[PDB]
Design a protein around this ligand. Sequence first.
Ligand SMILES: *[C@@H]1O[C@H](CO)[C@@H](O[C@@H]2O[C@H](CO)[C@@H](O[C@@H]3O[C@H](CO[C@H]4O[C@H](CO)[C@@H](O)[C@H](O[C@H]5O[C@H](CO)[C@@H](O)[C@H](O)[C@@H]5O[C@H]5O[C@H](CO)[C@@H](O)[C@H](O)[C@@H]5O)[C@@H]4O)[C@@H](O)[C@H](O[C@H]4O[C@H](CO)[C@@H](O)[C@H](O)[C@@H]4O[C@H]4O[C@H](CO)[C@@H](O)[C@H](O)[C@@H]4O)[C@@H]3O)[C@H](O)[C@H]2NC(C)=O)[C@H](O)[C@H]1NC(C)=O
Ligand SMILES: NS(=O)(=O)C1CCN(C(=O)N2C[C@H]3CN(C(=O)OCc4ccc(OC(F)(F)F)cc4)C[C@@H]3C2)CC1
Ligand SMILES: [Ca+2]
Ligand SMILES: [Ca+2]
Ligand SMILES: [Cl-]
Ligand code: NA
Ligand code: NA
Ligand SMILES: [Zn+2]
Length: 806
Amino acid sequence: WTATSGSCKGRCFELQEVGPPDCRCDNLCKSYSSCCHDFDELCLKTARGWECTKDRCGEVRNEENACHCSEDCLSRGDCCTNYQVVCKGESHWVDDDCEEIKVPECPAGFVRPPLIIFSVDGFRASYMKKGSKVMPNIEKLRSCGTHAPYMRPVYPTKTFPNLYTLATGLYPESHGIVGNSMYDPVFDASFHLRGREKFNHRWWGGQPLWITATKQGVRAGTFFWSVSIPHERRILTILQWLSLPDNERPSVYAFYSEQPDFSGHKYGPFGPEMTNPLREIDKTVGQLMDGLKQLRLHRCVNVIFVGDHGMEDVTCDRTEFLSNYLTNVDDITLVPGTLGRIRAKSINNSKYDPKTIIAALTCKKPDQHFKPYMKQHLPKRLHYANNRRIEDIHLLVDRRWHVARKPLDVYKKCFFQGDHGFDNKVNSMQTVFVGYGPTFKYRTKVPPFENIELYNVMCDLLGLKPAPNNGTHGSLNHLLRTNTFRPTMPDEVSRPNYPGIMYLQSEFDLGCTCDDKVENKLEELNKRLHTKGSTKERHLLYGRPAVLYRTSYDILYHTDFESGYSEIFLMPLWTSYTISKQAEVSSIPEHLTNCVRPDVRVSPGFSQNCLAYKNDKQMSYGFLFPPYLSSSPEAKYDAFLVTNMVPMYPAFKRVWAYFQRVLVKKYASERNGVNVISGPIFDYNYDGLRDTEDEIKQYVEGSSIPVPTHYYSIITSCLDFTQPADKCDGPLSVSSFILPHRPDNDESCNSSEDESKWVEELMKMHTARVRDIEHLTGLDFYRKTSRSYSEILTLKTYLHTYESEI
Ligand SMILES: *[C@@H]1O[C@H](CO)[C@@H](O[C@@H]2O[C@H](CO)[C@@H](O[C@@H]3O[C@H](CO[C@H]4O[C@H](CO)[C@@H](O)[C@H](O[C@H]5O[C@H](CO)[C@@H](O)[C@H](O)[C@@H]5O[C@H]5O[C@H](CO)[C@@H](O)[C@H](O)[C@@H]5O)[C@@H]4O)[C@@H](O)[C@H](O[C@H]4O[C@H](CO)[C@@H](O)[C@H](O)[C@@H]4O[C@H]4O[C@H](CO)[C@@H](O)[C@H](O)[C@@H]4O)[C@@H]3O)[C@H](O)[C@H]2NC(C)=O)[C@H](O)[C@H]1NC(C)=O
Ligand SMILES: NS(=O)(=O)C1CCN(C(=O)N2C[C@H]3CN(C(=O)OCc4ccc(OC(F)(F)F)cc4)C[C@@H]3C2)CC1
Ligand SMILES: [Ca+2]
Ligand SMILES: [Ca+2]
Ligand SMILES: [Cl-]
Ligand code: NA
Ligand code: NA
Ligand SMILES: [Zn+2]
């Protein structure tokens, strides 16, 4: 109940929300059916429109007008945004030449440069270039300020998940807004785009920027604007708030526009009808900047122009129907569209089986336009699994397509020509970032970056300590003139042991054999040096990774590679090696095919054994440093050490062998040498974080050898490829992956073909940031380079996407 008998007189767009049944006058009351009776009359005035004209100049104040052109309007803070232009011979902000803002130029009483976040829905990255002719205000922000060619949204590339990721710095799986539609089984409650349940606070996790600000004594404007408040009024309201006395005035503000998304759905991302919405957005930016100029704030305020996701061409005729695959179609609930989420229709139905549903959805049709996944098997880069609201069964839909349960859902629910929600690496889903103001750099282009990073920077801009989040604080220091965040490297927690030769061959009873007993102070003194680390400078280019958790491990040196061997998990945490452009690929000699050799530096009790692999009929083994890339016949024996061995399903060995035999050398040829760090990952609870020993669900049969869920590789070289990887004097270049360690290749529909037709495609899908690997392993890489730490943080957040040019 709301007793709408109170009055909005003097309270229009009040910043504090009064508790019902008192009538509200804040910019959210419309959404709650709770505004006072006179809200429209007093607060949403429209008389005379939004612009001054020559004849309105110097007028007698008429409080009925939407905005004002009387002499007192500046001190009242309520002129139309073009007042000084029309009436005082001033120029529009866009017509003024760009001039560097070296320091904030603020009116007295401003404690800090205000931040204004100008967010636009569905603003695809390529609009900056393709619509530049009709967006002069935005183009001036872009060219004069700091801009990225695009900004990567989070998956799914829908509105609420992305705006709330912008606000919190968190992945959707952590903030809880995992789609536009959700069922939470603990609450037994549903979240819907239209409706009231979405307002309940239990949906919204983490700590968004406005709460972070408020708790730290920085006042915030309201972030949410009710749909019926027009854009002009939103701008005028912000400008009025900026005229409040110092003690009442917020330092952070948001504007939101439902365009160009709204039209993009109806007309497609590049429909000719799209020119008008882009023009109108630009005019709104113009009004803000002219309004700030009138208030003398245009060289004081930091402005962020940011989108939530892009827009793709999608029509009704490109819909896959689950009724063309499943017999049991009515026993399931599907969340449909540009992704799919499946669960049982009834929890009382014990005939429901996810395994048979996945199977009936797998590679069933030649050009099938979605791929089914159990959520823990999705690419780790999506970070889309660790939430009870994310259904166990997921469909990744190809760009340009939809999935639906049955045809009736599509024609009884062509209308639309555009949609979004696809994999966040898809070019059409990319969106925009521009930063303009005293705290941003001048005329500066920065590399593309993820929207999870912005919360940290917005906190930096407001002098706030960010709540714990998924950004990597410092990775975006290069956007900022000042207010940078200068992190220290994490402290290493566990120091390695450096074992020498401590065990005789006969102490080992591992059931392993090698044809190696084939026998000189030349190469004998030489091999001792290699085991002591004499080539370590070649194979360990960026220092050894730090171990950020308590564990027991040994550094093992070899001619061709170096490893950090875990005595707890019985295998390396990491293996590091460098392959030059000149390196040659050799095969495994016939006599060495099944050779496995005890490591005399490492006790039998802390070793794997070959008998366990023999007895385990599902599990085979591979090697982290590949025997194919050995530098010499003698060095090759090192690659068969039991300490270089890891458990691998035969299906996965197909993938791994092709990577090691074919792809590493291809990369070294293309990149002028590469340094490779590979290792296992254990993430059985799919939280994107390293498992402890007691979280491991699978071991090699009859043993304490844990089975990795994933294998990673980090591949590093010189950004200036005229320099070899091992002699690089400047910035680095990286690509990484986290491959799921699966006992089948069902993910790859062409896997019956030669690895050359399907393996690289799989690896591209599972591209990763070094940072993702850090989380999954408790390791910290690039500890010893000649590069600044912030530059290394940027490198660690880099994602190689394999998409064409934007
Ligand atoms: C991205 O960044 C984020 C943010 O930094 C990282 O997420 C953090 O990870 C931490 C480690 O997992 C986690 O810490 C746990 O917090 C527990 C208390 O949590 C509450 O309080 C915090 C702080 O205010 C709050 O943020 C939490 O909010 C979560 O849950 C609510 C309600 O469900 C949601 O509204 C909200 O969206 C958020 O949900 C997300 O996180 C939870 C996990 O917390 C998931 O379950 C959800 O799916 C969703 O993703 C909470 O309100 C604390 O109790 C934990 O401590 C347990 O474990 C430690 C182990 O060290 C142990 O010492 C304790 O004894 C305790 O164990 C006991 O509980 C176990 C399970 O009940 C039980 O098995 C044991 O026997 C014991 O009884 C733990 O410290 C932190 O909460 C989240 N924060 C957020 C916001 O998500 C995230 O890791 C990053 N991702 C990547 C890839 O890097
Ligand atoms: N009610 S409805 O019309 O049926 C339905 C309602 C929900 N709707 C719908 O998509 N949204 C209604 C819109 C009003 N919001 C808004 O003002 O957002 C501003 C904002 C948000 C986050 C920000 O994050 C930060 F911190 F800056 F990084 C900043 C600014 C966005 C809402 C999405 C779809 C239509
Ligand atoms: Ca949107
Ligand atoms: Ca884990
Ligand atoms: Cl959704
Ligand atoms: Na086996
Ligand atoms: Na297959
Ligand atoms: Zn949309």
